[PDB]
Amino acid sequence: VSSAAVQWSWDAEFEEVSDDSPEFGQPEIPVKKAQGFVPISIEALQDEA
Amino acid sequence: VSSAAVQWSWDAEFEEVSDDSPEFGQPEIPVKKAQGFVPISIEALQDEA
Secondary structure (H helix, E strand, C coil), rough: EECCCCCCCCCCCCCCCCCCCCEEEEECCCCEECCCCCCHHHHHHHHHC | CCCCCCCECCCCCCCCCEEECEEECCCCCCCCCCCCCCCCCCHHHHHCC
């Protein structure tokens, strides 16, 4: 959730106020994945060191 | 022995990975020979100090 402040004002006596309702925003963060593969022969596993 | 790292990827769902087996190299250093020679005469070997 993201928002801001309320905007005041220097007013006089007997004067209406200004509508100061703030606004919002929703930041969104999708999640992604990465990959990596290594195939190897049976002979290599039991021969190489 | 030398080689390089393995490549990764950002993949979507249900996507086959690609084989990423690194390649390898064999650095080799041969050994060489240097020589020198100087002849002297018998009279020279007897006279000079």
